[PDB]
Amino acid sequence: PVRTTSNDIVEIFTVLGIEAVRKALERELYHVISFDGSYVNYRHLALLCD
Amino acid sequence: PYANQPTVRITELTDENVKFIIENTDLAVANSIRRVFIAEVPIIAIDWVQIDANSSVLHDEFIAHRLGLIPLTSDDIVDKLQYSRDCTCEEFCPECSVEFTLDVRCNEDQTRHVTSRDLISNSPRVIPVTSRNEQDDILIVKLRKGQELRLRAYAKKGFGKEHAKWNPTAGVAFEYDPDNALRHTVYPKPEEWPKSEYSELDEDESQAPYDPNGKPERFYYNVESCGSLRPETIVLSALSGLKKKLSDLQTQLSHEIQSDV
Amino acid sequence: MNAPPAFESFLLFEGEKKITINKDTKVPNACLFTINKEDHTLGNIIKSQLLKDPQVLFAGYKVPHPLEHKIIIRVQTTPDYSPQEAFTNAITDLISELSLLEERFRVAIKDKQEG
Amino acid sequence: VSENIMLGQLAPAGTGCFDLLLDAEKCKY
Amino acid sequence: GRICRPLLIVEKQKLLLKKRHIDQLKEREYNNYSWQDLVASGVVEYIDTLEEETVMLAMTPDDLQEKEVAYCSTYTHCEIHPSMILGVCASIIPFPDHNQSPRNTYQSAMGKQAMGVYITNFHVRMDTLAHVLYYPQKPLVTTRSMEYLRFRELPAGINSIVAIASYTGYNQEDSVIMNRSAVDRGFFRSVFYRSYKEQESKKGFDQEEVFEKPTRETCQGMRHAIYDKLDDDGLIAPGVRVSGDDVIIGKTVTLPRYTKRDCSTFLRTSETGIVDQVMVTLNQEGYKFCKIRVRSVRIPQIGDKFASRHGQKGTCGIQYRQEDMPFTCEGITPDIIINPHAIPSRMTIGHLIECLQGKVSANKGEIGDATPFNDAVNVQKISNLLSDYGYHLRGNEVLYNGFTGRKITSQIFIGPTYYQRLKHMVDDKIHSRARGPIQILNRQPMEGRSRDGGLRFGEMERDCQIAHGAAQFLRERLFEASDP
Amino acid sequence: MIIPVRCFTCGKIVGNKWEAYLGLLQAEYTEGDALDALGLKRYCCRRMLLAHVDLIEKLLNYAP
Amino acid sequence: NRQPTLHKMSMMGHRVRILPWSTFRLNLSVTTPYNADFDGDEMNLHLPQSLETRAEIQELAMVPRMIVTPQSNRPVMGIVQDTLTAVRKFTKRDVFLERGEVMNLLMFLSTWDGKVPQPAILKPRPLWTGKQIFSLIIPGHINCIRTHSTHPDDEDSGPYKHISPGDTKVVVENGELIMGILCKKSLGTSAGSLVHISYLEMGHDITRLFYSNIQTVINNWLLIEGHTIGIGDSIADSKTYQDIQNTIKKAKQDVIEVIEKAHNNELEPTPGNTLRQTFENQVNRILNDARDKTGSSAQKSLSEYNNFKSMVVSGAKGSKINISQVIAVVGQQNVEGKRIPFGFKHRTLPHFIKDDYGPESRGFVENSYLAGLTPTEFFFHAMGGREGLIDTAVKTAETGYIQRRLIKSMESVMVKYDATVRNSINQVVQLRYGEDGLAGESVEFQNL
Amino acid sequence: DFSARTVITPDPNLSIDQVGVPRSIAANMTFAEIVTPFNIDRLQELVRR
Amino acid sequence: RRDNELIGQTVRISQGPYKGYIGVVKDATESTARVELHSTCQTISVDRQRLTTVG
Amino acid sequence: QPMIYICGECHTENEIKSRDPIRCRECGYRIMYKKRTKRLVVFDAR
Amino acid sequence: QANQKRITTPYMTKYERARVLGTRALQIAMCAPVMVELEGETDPLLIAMKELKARKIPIIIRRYLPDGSYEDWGVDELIISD
Ligand SMILES: [Zn+2]
Ligand SMILES: [Zn+2]
Ligand SMILES: [Zn+2]
């Protein structure tokens, strides 16, 4: 019940909340941008997720 | 701290090309001489056209540009003529230009080949190369029955840097170190490369051994002239031109050293 | 629309100097010769002739831009000598070499025609 | 910024987030 | 509407196209035996896409022979030649089976933009836009399909001695270096023909237009331009030089600078042409109708786009003279120099093979057969044939630096390659504006070079300057430089 | 549409070689041997004579 | 400016240089931010008509100040095609320059004190090395450590770690290139390169000069060395071709065996995948292994003089895959991530039998671009290419609409004077920018 | 206003902060420079030109 | 400073680098005129002293 | 007023004046071409 | 706001520097008095820049705060970084 997560940010917001979906959204964006080996500063993903 | 003592050995001399060899000189002097043969050797060529009538299938700029590329005999005349920029006349005077004329009309049913023979000049010394008394005449334009081409051209003195029509060379085969002794090139598979005509090596060998104390010497040349200037006149006019440029530069230099104070 | 005149590479414009000498302040006994309306034809021969002078510590040439038709030649010499003097001797040496090469070419041509 | 841009005013962005005043205490040529 | 194509019928294991047919087809001009008689003989059949599902094809007759392992053994049709799957703009590509497919697509899109001789009767046609090349040449490396496309008769390019090398760096990032001396001899030189049309309308007695040399004392809408070139009839004469902002057709309309206004037709800005011919006739309404074809010689310069037949597109980075260009042991300077960096990413090996076959064709005295699928021609055979003329079998050649004469350590690759000049010149694209005309609805700059319009400082630009925090620039561009 | 005057690469005159080149081809000569007889050794000039298309001959079929 | 303006560097400040011809001439290193190539691209130019705007652009949007980007805290403009292939072939261990060539190169240095360095070889002939001149190109006394593209992994562990045999392990100390071969990993747009360190330690003006110097000097040396590409670089010895043909003949035989197993029901599905999916995965695996094996064989056959290798090592343009496709084998053509589908009734083309899942029938291009593609392989390759054109022509609308949506949602969000991040409504989004109040330009990767 | 557009070209002889602007675009576009005793001379000559 | 007599006339440049080039004067000034060179496609400014009217 | 125009095939310099219908008086062709100007049109052979 | 306790950063921002040089350059272009020496400086930009390096610019930057308050920071009190 600690590491089990999902990619559906709606379910995260409905079950865990707004700070959880904030982090889950950042993890999903980071995964989308890093899959091709690229990298973007965290301050940008954070500004968007916030 | 001084100049070199170069030598020359001509291996072939004809009316079309000259093959010579320069030894005991620097690569810079040999390359600059090669560049002068193409860009700083004066020659006479058409640089002004006035089309009075042109009913041919080729527009005026097409004919003018064609006429400019026709080589004109300039062996002894180019040294006497002057550049239009320095000449104190106007229009196109006989001391700074050579007037040409063309008047052709196709009256017959057969196609009329307007050739360089039809270019009538006022000076018998400056005439088209093909017209000089084998080689056929240069083709300017073909005419159909009822067509006309009438103009009045003027030739001027110029060099290659202004336009390629003023280039008296048709190829300058400059070569040095046929056997790759200085290793200026690095053949990854020297056995796959052919041997130069000036190479002196057995067929069992590909390239000469490396020479650490070696310097570029024995520069080979093949100056193929277009026909305007004899192959030897190009070389003489080149060396004289480069020596004049250096003389003028030395003059401007002394004027700047003196102007200091 | 913007094709520069062909004569603009060799003819000097009204009031423009053919050569300018600028003393280099970075190191002593060095100068920069900015020659207008010239190219690698003179820069290479002058560079090479300057390198042969043992009293010349540096001799190089460059074209600031191929579209421009100017050239800059840098010359550094020993304290007992002078860069202007080196550039002058280098031109004099090239003139003597070309004069000699011309006479030996006329001789070679005469010998080849007569056979 | 979109509003000030539509009105052609200095958008409160970068060089527009402040105002400059003259200093009479230092104007001593 | 059922798209179909012909195919050679196949019997049990052999073709029906015997030698007696090829014999009759060779003497086609004598015995009048054409394709119709070939189809009527039951040798060829038109097969459509829906019938191809039930058909078993053979690419070549070689597939019909007995092999160690039988693949099909029950063929029913055969392809005449596999190269026929290509279109028109793709058939002109030499060795298209040696290049990346996108490149062949980009070439098929460039072949339509290449200059040449679009039609033989170009002096009579008064087309609004026409580009004619001075010296068109047929490609030394050609495909056997061009004989049918008539590319041999109306070519669209020039065979250029191209050298794939980095010379001063002016050919980087899809750019090329040209030989100024070649350009002076008419290399890729072309002419641009533009036709201007106009007519005088007699719609009613209230106001009628007429061609006549306008006059300052009587005309109202006369620009600052001089009308002296115009003839009495208001039309201009051929052979006259006309620049931008000049008048070529003097038309006036009667008013309801008194009783008549000037309605003349001016030339487009930045043209500087010469009038080639002028024509006068009557339209459907029986009114006077004039067409003026201006001629402008376009010399290849920096910015003009050139492209080979393999997607290798680029603009002329700089023009070096013959003294400054590299050269081989013999006086062969490259007409064009391209950056080798465009070859590995794009993988246009056909460009290299074309450059090889062209050198062999030029030294052998023939025309290279670059048919796509031809087992009788590969890179090894071309390499062996090149070694017989005293050249490196891989096309490389020793070059000498034109500025210092020193040899180049890396043996450069050089040879004849058919390049094409594209209608996308820089003179037709260069644009500038400074306090010009503005629209009527909104007092903002116009749109287009033809209207001296301004450039669009779009939203994406606003976003960029917002990121820079440049509020004054963003204000000057959206308010002070556009519509204060 | 008509044979150029000089070779774009080198500068050798080729305008006086077209008629002679055609005159050799009709004489049962091969394109290579014909180019050799005219003195075109470099592949640049041979390119000029072997890749040219005399389009002017078709333009003269139209009345002036 | 150049459209589409994607990032802030697509609009940079430039100083005017008036010259004759009618084209906008740019430096080659500044072409990467704009994503501009010279194949006919057009770029706009806006001229500010006020001293305020002139100073603003001179201090906020100039090219030197825009070298490093906050997007990924690394430089966006770096060395390019010729200057990168030549700098690779220039900094090698076997590059020796004479007194004439050195004087020719040093003349193109703006940041030169006029003192010629003592050559690395004084006898029997005075000779300078490429690294000895590059040391003069490098400004200040920066320090850096990188690794060349060909740097083996078994070298930093064993002996010779500090004295590399292949001249890898770039080491700059006190502004001198002590050793190493430079490439994209040391001069490109990567993080921690010599340029990034030059922009951090030294100012922006110094890095500007560092860029110009590299371009001028290296291009003037390349004028001597020269770089090219031809058939000689795409050809391999008969041994390599035999190894390639044998590898492909074996791959096709294995696929034939996989087909015989599935046809005889001797193939079982894998957990979580269908029998068909299992078969296609096995076939794709066999073909991918063959492509990798042949590609490695081609890479091993390239000589140190090969120009393709010279392009991939420096990273100027291309990759090993391109070489494998030009020399050994193009590979399998994929449509929508899968092999060529049965467009016809159970067939890819009417030239193949029905139900032929073999490699040649489903789009395995066993030939290389040099050997030439067969008709079927050409058509299938055209399919593989067309999918790339379609994607490149369709993604532009969706991505541009996304860029617009993202801007309009975050266009007023800014860092106020109290260091907090607020929107137009004065609401607080972050008490400190990026939770730390630091700009993304000066930061860089480190190790705890 | 005060904008321009044309094809680009490589030029290794320019710094990264430099742009090669043709003489035609530079002649049509202008910059409003204020007059001062430091530039009254230059601006005067340019006006009379 | 506007010599309306010269504007529109055909002139032949009798001195300087452009010697031999004839053209039509687009704009005239007390000192220099703008001649539209017939030969080329470039309008140039030439001192009126060098110009020579034709016909 | 005095326009010595040319015909498309008949090529005759019929003096067609203004306020008239374009029509060749010799053959009836409706398309007319103007004659080359009398101005001095020069050309630099470059 | 109490000038004795100013919470903003003591350094001059890149935007503040840009606007300071711009406005001061405009002033110099309008023949305003110069504070420092002008050995060979005429272009108002170079003059304003030397004035910044010398720290002799008579301008006060009014940094507005989100709450509505403001802090007046003079060009001499701010620390120039670039
Ligand atoms: Zn005279
Ligand atoms: Zn030639
Ligand atoms: Zn008639």
Residues of chain B with CATH 3.30.1360.10: 1-42+165-261
Asked whether the beta carbons of E336 and E163 are under 8 A apart, the reply is yes
Q: Under the phi-then-psi rule, with left for phi > 0, alpha for psi from -120 to 50, and beta for the rest, what region is I16?
A: left
- Which of the 8 DSSP states describes residue J37? P
CA B230 vs. chain centroid, Å, equals: 10
Say how many Å lie between the CA of residue F40 and the centre of ligand 2. 8
| Tokens coding K78 | 């701010």
Number of neighbours of residue E244 by Cβ within 10 angstroms = 15
Candidates E266, E261, E265, E263; CA nearest to E218 is: E261
CATH code, domain carrying K49 = 3.90.940.10
Measured between alpha carbons, how far is residue A49 from residues A18, A20, A43, G398, G423 in Å?
Answer: 10, 11, 10, 21, 14
| Tokens coding I10 | 């055909």
Question: If one looks up domain F1-64 in CATH, what number appears?
Answer: 1.10.10.60
| Tokens coding C108 | 């070679």
What gap in Å lies between CA G37 and CA J43, rounded to an integer? 37
Helix, strand or coil, per DSSP, at residue G203:
coil
Total domain count for chain C?
1
Ligand nearest to the CA of F11: 2
What gap in Å lies between CA D10 and CA E474, rounded to an integer? 9
The CA distance from K63 to the nearest CA of chain D, in Å, is 5
The answer to whether the CB atoms of F42 and B137 lie below 8 A apart is no
Candidates E282, E319, E291; CA nearest to E303 is: E319
Strands E313-320 and E175-179: parallel
Helix, strand or coil, per DSSP, at residue G43:
strand
Cross-strand partners of E161:
E416
Say how many Å lie between the CA of residue B63 and the centre of ligand 3. 29
Query: Is B190 annotated in some ligand binding site?
Result: no
What's the farthest any 2 CA atoms get from each other in chain I? 28
Q: Is the dihedral of CA C56, C62, C64, C70 positive or negative?
A: positive
Q: Which residues contact K38 (CB under 8 A, 6 or more apart)?
A: K47
Asked whether the beta carbons of B6 and B33 are under 8 A apart, the reply is no
What gap in Å lies between CA G437 and CA G430, rounded to an integer? 9
What gap in Å lies between CA G392 and CA G386, rounded to an integer? 10
The answer to whether the CB atoms of H22 and C64 lie below 8 A apart is no
Helix, strand or coil, per DSSP, at residue E34:
coil
- Cβ-based burial of I42 (10 A; exposed 0-12, middle 13-18, buried ≥19): middle
Q: Given in angstroms, what resolution was this structure solved at?
A: 3.1
CA G428 vs. chain centroid, Å, equals: 40
CATH code, domain carrying C52 = 3.30.1360.10
The CA distance from F16 to the nearest CA of chain B, in Å, is 4
Q: Do chains G and B touch (3 or more CB pairs under 8 A)?
A: yes
Helix, strand or coil, per DSSP, at residue E433:
strand
Q: Which residues contact E171 (CB under 8 A, 6 or more apart)?
A: E177, E314, E317, E337, E338, E339, H10
What gap in Å lies between CA J41 and CA J44, rounded to an integer? 10
Asked whether the beta carbons of G42 and H39 are under 8 A apart, the reply is no
Render chain B in DSSP notation, one character per residue.
Answer: ------EEEEEEE-SSEEEEEEES--HHHHHHHHHHHHHS--EEEEEEEEEEEE-SSS-HHHHHHHHHTS-B--TTTTTT---TTT-S--TT-TTT-EEEEEEEE--SSSPEEEEGGG-EES-SSS-BTTT---PPPPEEEEE-TT-EEEE--EEEEE-TTT-GGG--EEEE--B--SS-SS-SS--SSGGGSPPPTT----TT-SSPPP-TT-----EEEEEEE-SSS-HHHHHHHHHHHHHHHHHHHHHHHHHHHHHT-
What gap in Å lies between CA G356 and CA G347, rounded to an integer? 7
Q: Under the phi-then-psi rule, with left for phi > 0, alpha for psi from -120 to 50, and beta for the rest, what region is K16?
A: alpha
Q: Which residues contact E136 (CB under 8 A, 6 or more apart)?
A: E116, E117, E154, E155, E156, E157, E158, F1, F53, F55
What gap in Å lies between CA G299 and CA G287, rounded to an integer? 18
| Relative orientation angle of helices G130-137 and G99-106, to the nearest 10 degrees | 20
B43-164: what fold?
RNA Polymerase Alpha Subunit; Chain A, domain 2 (2.170.120)
Tokens 């006919």: give the residue: G40
Chain E within 8 Å of H9 (Cβ-Cβ)? yes
K13: containing domain? 1-82
Helix, strand or coil, per DSSP, at residue H28:
helix
CA G65 vs. chain centroid, Å, equals: 23
- Cβ-based burial of E449 (10 A; exposed 0-12, middle 13-18, buried ≥19): middle
Helix, strand or coil, per DSSP, at residue G156:
coil
Render E79-133 in DSSP notation, one character per residue.
Answer: -S-GGGGS-HHHHTSSSGGGB-HHHHHHHHHHTTTB-B-S-TTTTT---SSEEEE
What gap in Å lies between CA F18 and CA F25, rounded to an integer? 11
Amino acid making up residue E300 = P
Q: Which residues of C touch G (CB under 8 A)?
A: 1-4, 24, 26-27, 30, 47-48, 51, 57-62, 65, 67-68, 72, 74, 76
The answer to whether the CB atoms of E478 and D10 lie below 8 A apart is no
Query: Is F44 annotated in some ligand binding site?
Result: yes
What gap in Å lies between CA E277 and CA B24, rounded to an integer? 62
The answer to whether the CB atoms of E378 and G3 lie below 8 A apart is no
Each residue of B169-187: b (16+ CB within 10 Å) or e? bbbbbbbbbbbbebbbbeb
Number of neighbours of residue K27 by Cβ within 10 angstroms = 20
Candidates E76, E338, B163; CA nearest to H10 is: E338
Best of H31, H33, H34 to disrupt the K interface (most K CBs within 10 Å) is: H34
Measured between alpha carbons, how far is residue G293 from residues B198, G286, G329, G370 in Å?
Answer: 47, 11, 10, 18
Tokens 């795409």: give the residue: G234
Chain A within 8 Å of G26 (Cβ-Cβ)? no
Q: Which residues contact G4 (CB under 8 A, 6 or more apart)?
A: E460, G10, G400
Asked whether the beta carbons of G144 and G170 are under 8 A apart, the reply is yes
Is E174 among the catalytic positions? yes
What gap in Å lies between CA K52 and CA K35, rounded to an integer? 11
Partner-chain residue, chosen from H3, H9, H22, that has the shortest CB–CB distance to E317: H9
Strands C70-77 and C30-36: antiparallel
Candidates E461, D19, G128, E139; CA nearest to H3 is: E461
Q: Which residue of E has its CA nearest to K18?
A: E470
CA B258 vs. chain centroid, Å, equals: 38
- Cβ-based burial of E87 (10 A; exposed 0-12, middle 13-18, buried ≥19): exposed
Helix, strand or coil, per DSSP, at residue G252:
helix
- Which of the 8 DSSP states describes residue E236? P
The answer to whether the CB atoms of H16 and G21 lie below 8 A apart is no
| Relative orientation angle of helices A42-49 and A18-34, to the nearest 10 degrees | 140
The CA distance from E476 to the nearest CA of chain K, in Å, is 14
| Tokens coding B135 | 């080689």
Candidates B233, B121, B219, B125; CA nearest to B169 is: B233
CATH code, domain carrying J7 = 2.20.28.30
Helix, strand or coil, per DSSP, at residue E478:
helix
- Measured in degrees and rounded to the nearest 5, phi and psi for residue D3 equal -70, -50
Ligand nearest to the CA of B157: 1
Q: Do chains G and F touch (3 or more CB pairs under 8 A)?
A: no
The answer to whether the CB atoms of I10 and J40 lie below 8 A apart is yes
Q: Which residues contact G397 (CB under 8 A, 6 or more apart)?
A: none
Candidates G34, G38, G40; CA nearest to G63 is: G34
| Relative orientation angle of helices G51-60 and K44-54, to the nearest 10 degrees | 60
What gap in Å lies between CA B58 and CA E183, rounded to an integer? 19
Say how many Å lie between the CA of residue E420 and the centre of ligand 2. 20
- Cβ-based burial of B95 (10 A; exposed 0-12, middle 13-18, buried ≥19): exposed
- Helix (H) or strand (E) segment spanning residue F56: helix F56-59
The answer to whether the CB atoms of I41 and C1 lie below 8 A apart is yes
For the sheet with E4-9, list strands across it.
Answer: E44-48, E4-9, E77-78
Q: Which residues contact G446 (CB under 8 A, 6 or more apart)?
A: none
Number of neighbours of residue G100 by Cβ within 10 angstroms = 19
What gap in Å lies between CA A37 and CA A40, rounded to an integer? 10
Say how many Å lie between the CA of residue A44 and the centre of ligand 2. 61
- Which of the 8 DSSP states describes residue C88? H
Measured between alpha carbons, how far is residue F64 from residues B103, E118, J5 in Å?
Answer: 18, 20, 15
What gap in Å lies between CA C30 and CA G338, rounded to an integer? 70
Q: Which residues contact G86 (CB under 8 A, 6 or more apart)?
A: E166, G218, G219, G221, G222, G225, G227
Amino acid making up residue G378 = F
Chain C within 8 Å of B257 (Cβ-Cβ)? yes
Q: What does the domain layout of chain F look like in residue ranges?
A: 1-64
What gap in Å lies between CA K24 and CA K26, rounded to an integer? 5
B1-42+165-261: what fold?
Gyrase A; domain 2 (3.30.1360)
Cross-strand partners of B128:
B72
Tokens 């580009």: give the residue: E131
The CA distance from E20 to the nearest CA of chain G, in Å, is 27
Number of neighbours of residue E242 by Cβ within 10 angstroms = 23
Say how many Å lie between the CA of residue B171 and the centre of ligand 2. 8
Total domain count for chain K?
1
Q: Please tell me the experimental approach by which this structure was elucidated.
A: cryo-EM
Asked whether the beta carbons of B82 and B108 are under 8 A apart, the reply is no
What gap in Å lies between CA J39 and CA E239, rounded to an integer? 8
Candidates G119, B249, G115; CA nearest to C30 is: G115
Q: Is the dihedral of CA G353, G358, G364, G370 positive or negative?
A: negative
Amino acid making up residue G277 = Q
Partner-chain residue, chosen from J32, J37, J39, that has the shortest CB–CB distance to E280: J32
What gap in Å lies between CA E163 and CA G446, rounded to an integer? 46
What gap in Å lies between CA B135 and CA B153, rounded to an integer? 24
The answer to whether the CB atoms of I21 and J42 lie below 8 A apart is yes
Q: Hey, which residues 19-48 in chain A have their CB within 8 Å of chain G?
A: 38-44, 46-48
C52: containing domain? 1-115
